């Protein structure tokens, strides 16, 4: 038994990943002679941590908690990709497609808003060698791409953009431009993040797994206008495995 749209709509449950029974402590065996896909990978963040700036360079900054202000709009879902078996018996997931990004903005103490593109785009994540069974101790570790939070058509409030827009501060016609260069010339960052997925529940019958993730990535740099913040995201995940 499962629910319909009209049971779910408006509750917040649409932003939650499927959960597995606490009885699901099995193992899903892997035959290097078969091929597999992730038919659905769901990532639901529960915590956004942002690293502070300690003025000096001898005390090192901490990851501090933040408040979400963009509501139940945060989960990645319907992600799919190849689950491959490597020469050494490690497994490697290769993301192909899905709803694999969500803009989020969280608010720090003092009121600074920190936007970020929560994503696993182009995720490649691999296990240890000699897996042969996905268990409640299997860990996937990988890297993904973090494109710029705004894409190239985005126009700032004075009409400046990368692929569109003005190339100068037109409201200041005879101002010195050298000082304005960082705001006037937009650029498109592409950085890497890292993610760990920790499998803690396995339904061997059905191929479903679930557990915990921690991800690290950069926040929005507003097309090069300012330096990004480092962000750590924790949450839960669910995935369904299928033979190809």
């Amino acid at each position: 038994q499962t629910l319909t749209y009209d049971d779910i709509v408006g509750t917040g449950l649409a932003n939650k990943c499927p959960t597995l029974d606490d009885t699901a402590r099995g193992a899903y065996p892997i035959d290097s002679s078969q091929t597999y896909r992730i038919a659905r990978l769901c990532l639901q963040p529960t915590t956004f941590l942002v690293k502070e700036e300690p003025k000096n360079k001898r005390q090192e900054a901490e990851f501090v908690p933040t408040k979400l202000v963009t509501r139940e709009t945060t989960s990645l879902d319907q992600i799919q990709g190849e689950l491959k078996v490597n020469s050494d018996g490690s497994l490697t997931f290769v993301e192909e497609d899905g709803i694999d990004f969500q803009p989020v903005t969280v608010q720090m103490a003092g009121g600074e808003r920190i936007p970020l593109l929560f994503t696993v785009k182009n995720l490649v994540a691999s296990t240890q060698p000699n897996v042969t069974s996905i268990t409640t101790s299997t860990d996937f570790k990988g890297e993904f791409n973090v494109p710029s939070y705004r894409t190239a058509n985005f126009l700032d409030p004075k009409g400046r953009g990368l692929a569109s827009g003005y190339d100068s501060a037109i409201a200041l016609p005879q101002a010195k431009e050298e000082e304005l260069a960082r705001a006037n010339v937009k650029r498109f960052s592409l950085t890497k993040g890292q993610i760990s997925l920790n499998v803690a529940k396995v339904d061997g019958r059905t191929g479903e797994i679930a557990g915990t993730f921690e991800s690290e990535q950069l926040s929005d740099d507003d097309m090069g206008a300012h330096e990004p913040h480092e962000v750590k995201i924790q949450g839960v995940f669910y995935a369904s495995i299928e033979p190809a």
Binding site: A169, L180, A183, M223
Partner: peptide, 13 residues
């Protein structure tokens, strides 16, 4: 307003 907006691309009114 113009001085701020030229320098701060997140400032919008």
């Amino acid at each position: 307003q113009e001085i701020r907006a030229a320098e701060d691309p997140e400032f919008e009114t």
